Design a protein around this ligand. Structure first.
Ligand SMILES: Nc1ccn([C@@H]2O[C@H](COP(=O)(O)OP(=O)(O)OP(=O)(O)O)[C@@H](O)[C@H]2O)c(=O)n1
Ligand SMILES: [Mg+2]
Ligand SMILES: [Mg+2]
Ligand SMILES: [Zn+2]
Length: 462
RNA sequence: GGUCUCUCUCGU
RNA sequence: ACGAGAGAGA
């Protein structure tokens, strides 16, 4: 991805979009009980913690575009992936606006607790003023689609979240592109059935982990992914995507049966307009992260990416022996022979992609179940039943979360959630985490889950 | 102050 | 089942 132009809002006639500049994150009562190295991300340009210009740091992620049209590796890759998807028999028919707005069994309803985007957000119009859970009224929605139409600009806000100190010093906060409700609706109508299929089928046919539940999914993955593991990270995936991957996405969609009107919508996320503050800017390439389908399309593109890299980097690849599961840019994959990722990475560079050793190691090492991670979790066989696999969120990560809150009112819920993540690491580590939580007055006021209950509730899932 | 997923909690 | 809230992940 690459910023094509920037114009003031006077010149484009776009309403300014300003977001908050103060973090809602405050240190929790456990801040000094656990060690951690993250803080609230830089939200404002005059943040004393800065060491670089903010805005230039924020937008440096648009590293530019290499390929615009599919070469022959990418084509072959798209087709292999699309043929794989066909057995799922995705219903390419348009989803009704009522189902799109208000949801189904395999698609959650549009979030009514979340902004409505351009232009409503500047007009004081919330999602709740157009949609109603109980009514399932679609009438005002239709009315607004007509008034403001589609392809409305994304609103750019900075994400309020904890970031490692290095990224705070270097102003590398993340940006989210707040969709217009109109585009969300329309994209859900076009692909809601695809969404439903993906959510209902995490695994190696979708090649996706969206919809997965780590407690139960981590036990399938060594069966789903037989042979030699490989994995890596992308640096700035969404923005690093060149238009070719959107061309590629299109070919997959066509091949599984989408109408050209349906397929045409891809170009409207490949080429987007964004309002950040008082300006309008144009982005060519790059997933507008915040659009409907972000996760699924990233996952799909990722599947295309992996195949294309493999048959370009190596001789005699059999794509049919490829297994992979993607969650956006997060990948875990296997093949009957070990795959050298340093070379995949060299090839990816030519495509504008930046690929780094699993977990930000210094170098590309062997990936095995003992050191693999996916969705930040490790893989740890249960000592009693070794075919049942724990997803292990590292305690260091759990320590970062607990040291802050955005509202201490919900402390109880927060610590409980962490415990649900922590116990997988084992009895000894878990009680250590609990005893440290207990070491402080608020901590002694909290209901903390009993370990063996957690374990036995885990086992009962199977 | 986005798209989504998973899980938990509290209600009726 | 329907409502509200939270955490986590991409
Ligand atoms: N809160 C998030 C996090 C991630 N993503 C999507 O998932 C991809 C991968 O996210 P991640 O690997 O966690 O971050 P990067 O964007 O690769 O890294 P950076 O922090 O450098 O931007 C992104 O490209 C983005 O499209 C997202 O939509 N929302
Ligand atoms: Mg990445
Ligand atoms: Mg990973
Ligand atoms: Zn443009």
């Amino acid at each position: 991805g690459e910023i094509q132009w920037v114009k003031p809002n006077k010149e484009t006639g776009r309403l300014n979009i300003n977001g908050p500049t103060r973090t809602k994150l405050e240190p929790s009562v456990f801040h000094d009980v656990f060690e951690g190295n993250k803080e609230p991300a830089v939200l404002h340009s005059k943040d004393p913690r800065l060491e670089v210009d903010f805005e230039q740091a924020l937008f440096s992620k648009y590293v530019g575009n290499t390929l615009y049209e599919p070469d022959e590796y990418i084509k072959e890759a798209a087709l292999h992936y699309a043929n794989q998807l066909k057995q799922l028999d995705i219903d390419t028919s348009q989803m009704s606006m009522e189902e799109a707005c208000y949801g189904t069994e395999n698609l959650e309803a549009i979030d009514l607790h979340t902004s409505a985007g351009y232009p409503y957000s500047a007009l004081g119009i919330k999602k709740r003023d157009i949609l109603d859970s109980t009514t399932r009224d679609v009438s005002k929605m239709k009315f607004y689609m007509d008034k403001y139409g589609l392809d409305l600009p994304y609103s750019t806000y900075v994400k309020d979240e904890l970031r490692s100190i290095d990224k705070i010093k270097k102003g590398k906060s993340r940006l989210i592109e707040a969709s217009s409700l109109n585009d969300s609706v329309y994209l859900r109508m076009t692909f809601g059935h695809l969404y439903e299929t993906f959510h209902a089928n995490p695994g190696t046919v979708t090649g996706s982990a969206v919809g997965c539940n780590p407690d139960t999914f981590w036990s399938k993955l060594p069966i789903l992914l037989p042979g030699s593991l490989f994995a890596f990270d992308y640096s700035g995936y969404d923005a690093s995507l060149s238009p070719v991957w959107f061309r590629a996405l299109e070919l997959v969609l066509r091949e599984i049966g989408y109408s050209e009107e349906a397929v045409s919508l891809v170009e409207g996320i490949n080429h987007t307009h964004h309002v950040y503050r008082n300006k309008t800017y144009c982005v060519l390439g790059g997933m507008p992260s915040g659009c409907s389908g972000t996760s699924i399309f990233n996952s799909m593109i990722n599947n295309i990416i992996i195949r294309a890299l493999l048959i370009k980097t190596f001789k005699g690849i059999d794509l049919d022996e490829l297994n992979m599961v993607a969650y956006g840019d997060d990948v875990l994959a296997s093949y009957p022979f070990p795959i050298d990722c340093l070379e995949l990475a060299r090839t990816g560079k030519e495509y504008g992609l930046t690929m780094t050793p699993a977990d930000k190691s210094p170098c590309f090492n062997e990936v095995n179940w003992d050191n693999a991670t996916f969705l930040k979790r490790g893989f740890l066989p249960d000592e009693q039943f070794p075919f049942l696999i724990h997803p292990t969120m590292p305690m260091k990560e759990i320590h970062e979360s607990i040291r802050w809150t955005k509202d201490a009112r919900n402390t109880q819920d927060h610590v409980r959630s962490l415990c649900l993540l922590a116990w997988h690491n084992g009895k000894q580590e878990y009680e250590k985490f609990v005893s440290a939580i207990r070491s402080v007055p608020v901590g002694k006021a909290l209901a903390i889950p009993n370990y063996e209950n957690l374990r036995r509730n885990w086992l009962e899932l199977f």
